[PDB]
Write a protein that binds this ligand. Sequence first.
Ligand SMILES: CC(C)(COP(=O)(O)OP(=O)(O)OC[C@H]1O[C@@H](n2cnc3c(N)ncnc32)[C@H](O)[C@@H]1OP(=O)(O)O)[C@@H](O)C(=O)NCCC(=O)NCCS
Ligand SMILES: CC(C)(COP(=O)(O)OP(=O)(O)OC[C@H]1O[C@@H](n2cnc3c(N)ncnc32)[C@H](O)[C@@H]1OP(=O)(O)O)[C@@H](O)C(=O)NCCC(=O)NCCS
Lengths: 286, 286, 385, 385
Amino acid sequence: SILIDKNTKVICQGFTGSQGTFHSEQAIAYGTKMVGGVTPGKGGTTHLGLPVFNTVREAVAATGATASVIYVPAPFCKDSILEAIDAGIKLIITITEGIPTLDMLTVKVKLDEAGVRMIGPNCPGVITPGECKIGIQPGHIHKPGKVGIVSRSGTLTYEAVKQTTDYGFGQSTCVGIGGDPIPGSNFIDILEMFEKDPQTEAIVMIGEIGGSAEEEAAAYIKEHVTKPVVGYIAGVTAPKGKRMGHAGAIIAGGKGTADEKFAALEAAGVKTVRSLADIGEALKTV
Amino acid sequence: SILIDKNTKVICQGFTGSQGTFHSEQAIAYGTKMVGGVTPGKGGTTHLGLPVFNTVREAVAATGATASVIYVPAPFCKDSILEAIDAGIKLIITITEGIPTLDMLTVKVKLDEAGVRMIGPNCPGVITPGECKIGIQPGHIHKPGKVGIVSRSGTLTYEAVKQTTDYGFGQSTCVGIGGDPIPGSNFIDILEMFEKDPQTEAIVMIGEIGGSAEEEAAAYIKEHVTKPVVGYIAGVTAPKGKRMGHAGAIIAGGKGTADEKFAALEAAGVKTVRSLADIGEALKTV
Amino acid sequence: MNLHEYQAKQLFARYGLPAPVGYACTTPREAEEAASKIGAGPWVVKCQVHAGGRGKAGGVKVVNSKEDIRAFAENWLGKRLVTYQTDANGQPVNQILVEAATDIAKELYLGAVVDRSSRRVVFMASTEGGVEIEKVAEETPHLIHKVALDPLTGPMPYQGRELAFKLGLEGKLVQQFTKIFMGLATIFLERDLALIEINPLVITKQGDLICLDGKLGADGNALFRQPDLREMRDQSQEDPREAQAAQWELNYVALDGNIGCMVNGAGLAMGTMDIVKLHGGEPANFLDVGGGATKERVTEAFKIILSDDKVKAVLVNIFGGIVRCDLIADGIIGAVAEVGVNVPVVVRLEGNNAELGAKKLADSGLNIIAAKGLTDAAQQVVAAV
Amino acid sequence: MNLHEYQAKQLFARYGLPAPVGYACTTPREAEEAASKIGAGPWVVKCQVHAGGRGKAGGVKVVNSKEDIRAFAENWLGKRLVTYQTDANGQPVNQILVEAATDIAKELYLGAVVDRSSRRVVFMASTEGGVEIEKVAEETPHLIHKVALDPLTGPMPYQGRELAFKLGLEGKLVQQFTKIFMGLATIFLERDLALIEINPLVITKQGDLICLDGKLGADGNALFRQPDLREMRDQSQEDPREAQAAQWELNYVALDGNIGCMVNGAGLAMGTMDIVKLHGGEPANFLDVGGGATKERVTEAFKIILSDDKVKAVLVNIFGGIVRCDLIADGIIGAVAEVGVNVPVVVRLEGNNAELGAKKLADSGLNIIAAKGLTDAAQQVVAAV
Ligand SMILES: CC(C)(COP(=O)(O)OP(=O)(O)OC[C@H]1O[C@@H](n2cnc3c(N)ncnc32)[C@H](O)[C@@H]1OP(=O)(O)O)[C@@H](O)C(=O)NCCC(=O)NCCS
Ligand SMILES: CC(C)(COP(=O)(O)OP(=O)(O)OC[C@H]1O[C@@H](n2cnc3c(N)ncnc32)[C@H](O)[C@@H]1OP(=O)(O)O)[C@@H](O)C(=O)NCCC(=O)NCCS
């Protein structure tokens, strides 16, 4: 179990909006410790039974939450991400899709400098089966277990989740790092949290075309990851130089192809799988 | 014979360009007295055997021409029309198509205030069969005669020219006033030059949709035109609110339809013709 | 060239004129997210097509919930909207404008155009806001007040004030209106506009003037010096064939008839359409051949005219021009051949080698009828159908 | 989002960077009239398409007479140009850029992009001007120099100079280059660009730096705050279906295969395409269903996939999502009967009511094959062909 657990108190920024409301009920029902939410101008009211604040700082005082989930539209996301960093939230989970690459580039710098952690943006979220759910993922397909998963794709995660629930293994914690070009946490940051997690016996690492986060992690894995790692890369049949849905999913200047990633994952001795159908199968081999 | 004749000395602005060169040879060969031309930066050279000047003033001095034909692209036409007005040209013939409406609105005010005459823009020109030709029209279809013609359309003029050459009548002087919304000379200005022209026994007035120059001339004709007038209006089958080729050819706010123009020419007692085929025929009746 | 409502509103904003807060959206998600950016409801959702009478057609609505916004967007984006000013196809809706609702106290009319008659830019105001201005001008002409910009001085505040008083405004509304007059007058002269229409120019319950709708027309002849406006053109709102013709220096306008016309000359083109009508025919299009009637250009014209299936015959009428009549006849044949024209083509040539060319056409052994003169050619095509 | 060369050049001009004198033309007449507006010849004529390798395809030429310009324009406007970077259809040429010829002394390369790896905007310079930069980087990586904009301070002059000296420039060329680096770096940050490419950045025989070509990419995610750039988008350069899909919250990209795919999720969509490949199939397109798999949205997706005739079968694969599977199966059927889907449709549902839905599909009678799991569904479609 990494990042979150039964004890993590969470507030939601953009709490009174469509997605915010909906996915919060889902979290509340799953048992997640939503302690409240923020929507400027609606401070001093209740929504889904929790208190709503005008600013992230007032929320942090009144509740002492330490993580924030963001359901705020792209145009204002950078402001809200920085507001959280600045009210002392130590864990930020951003669902929002469409944040300008240049905004992330600046936000990333500030995250790292201020010691804050952010999963996202443009991601499903994070879940610790049985204890905590922050995100849009469907809670009933996971089961407390020993496999940890990091993925750039959300839906691909659900395939792997399902397989590992069926082969009976279960999951420690599932991390969706997002499909953007510059996320707040990449593979190596999450890989390393698993290596040090007792509850995690093996790791399922799911990636896709574009960028070099896979390759860089490969290199890291070889040298610092001891637990068994099974990886799958999506996008072998993808055309060059075209965004494939995800802003970060694009083969640019002939770099970041599905295959180079496989190749390099294998060099680091990772159990690659060519069909996402056999993810469960390969874990049986560990 | 109005506006020009065997004695009119002419300079051409834009003389060394494509259209300028070509249509000048045609005027030379027809015997128009082309005394020279202007093209900034090519002053002090000869082209088509005439002298080329840097400014309209230098030309007017060295030759004493009094009329200028303009073959200068729309973007610089206003400058060149105003320079000619300044160097004292008393007659300006502008072929150029595409001059911004607002430029003409200003140029018109200057023309009237400075007592200069301009036929155009966006027109075929002016011809006095046998004596003078300034424009693009084909000289060999006219013949010295007694019918004067004013037209917003150039090609329609050629039909009428042809008919009156065949029926033997011939033409005094043919005036293409142009297809723009705001021309430098309208119907009434040219109508009145004919009324006072001995060589002109009858008048062929050709218009089309849009504007109210026809109507206004009608009213004028009734009260001040004595000679016989045969008119034709093009555009009965034209849709509303669509430019029909000519910038000035458009029925706007339901005004300026082919029919109201016929109606009003008839009220002033004008021989209207519903088929441009029978223009000659109606002139036989005078 | 026409502009969209959202585009005119941006322009007004640039010159500091007042318009409601709004956002142009290209997806239902953008549309629904505009809600909260704007504020509390209700909101106005408007399809963005060049034509008017969008209201009537149900392309404009006031809604109360984000879902309703999404619903509207989903219903229209990608569809064509037909109003009484669009042809039978209507215009494609590719954007929804979502703006804040306005508390309307009174509706006025402000507009400007180039008055061909007086040779001036004329501004018109009326208290008859919300009505097609041509109705008002026919029924109650004394209800429309005008002023004309003096080209020597440019727009002056006394002109703005006069209209303001004739409309019976007083107080701060006189100032606001003067300022709007001054803005619009400026934009008009600066961006080479052809037409401006604020219908309605509203007086809000809170006492302010605001431009609820906006309709601008730019002088296409001036685009060479209006780089920003050039970029704002939306070809999707026009008959694609019109643009296609323009690339080939042809002026095309589709009509409903079955006799196609290819003529050189705007006037001769309109004349030809008329004489075909006179003799029972039904002109199917206006097409003026701008360039020299060269093989390639003539071929193209055929492709465009025939793109319409209602066409049953084609009348070509070419007088003079800068191409020898025998070369034209050559091109007409090569066109009929490369294009594969099924209908009968009647041709009227006139000028150098007209005699020689007509023979070439007749000997060709294609469905080409060389006519002997205008009226014959007219009767011939009418006949061929 | 991409921009045309002429649009990038305009942008440079606004920020004071140097480009040659030129005019973008839409008609051969405009093209030929550009001649004299530019000056004495010779001139460069360039087709304006988003793709590169326009030179090779013969879309760029140096000519000597006004006639030659007209000729080029006539030859290309309205045609599609195929370069090694365009698909087989090529992109439509609707404008010709006509600019003054440049006396080239030396050709350099200047460019910037967001380096995913270092999380910085990186600028790259090289003396290998006139060559595809990816060749240079693979063969001679030591000939490419880079600097990275510090988000804290913004572009600094020392970084401009650094590159200038590594390229071996000296004197006034060092100043000029620094100023150009500063300009581009600013444009980059201010207009939310994703990519900049000046290839070649030329040193003229007269000793000055000038941007001969220009290639800009803007970050689509930022258009909401780049109004001007929004307006500059030219949809004519893209597969129309891509935009069409976008209106319906679908991400479409056509490929060449005969098995269509409708999946929800970018990763799952790419995964599905791969597993179909693994089992001998040929994916015909990538389509990610963004919105809820509602009847209307599912219908739309079918229309788009099937717009391609190579399609012989369709694989639907929907995992979870915010719509109960039985409702999805319902929509899939309506879709099929209403769109009139001929090819066999294989469906893989998963989540709430997955089994109830698979029954609804099977009892429907239509040619819908409910698959029992990913691999089976894969084999099924591959088989259906
Ligand atoms: C963020 C997103 C979910 C928002 O959608 P939404 O819930 O419909 O947006 P809404 O307008 O309904 O609500 C947004 C709320 O944020 C609030 N808000 C805006 N800026 C804010 C800020 N800085 N701080 C706090 N709240 C803020 C708004 O006021 C609004 O709430 P309100 O309606 O009470 O005013 C949507 O933009 C999005 O990004 N979708 C893609 C999600 C995705 O697929 N992710 C990847 C998963 S793999
Ligand atoms: C005006 C028009 C004929 C010019 O076309 P063009 O001859 O091909 O243009 P060119 O560039 O070849 O020549 C224009 C010349 O004007 C010159 N010129 C520019 N500004 C000038 C000025 N202020 N004064 C004088 N000459 C000037 C240019 O230098 C050029 O000469 P150059 O080529 O030797 O440098 C054309 O733009 C036009 O309006 N055509 C339509 C005419 C028409 O069809 N009318 C309706 C008949 S019914």
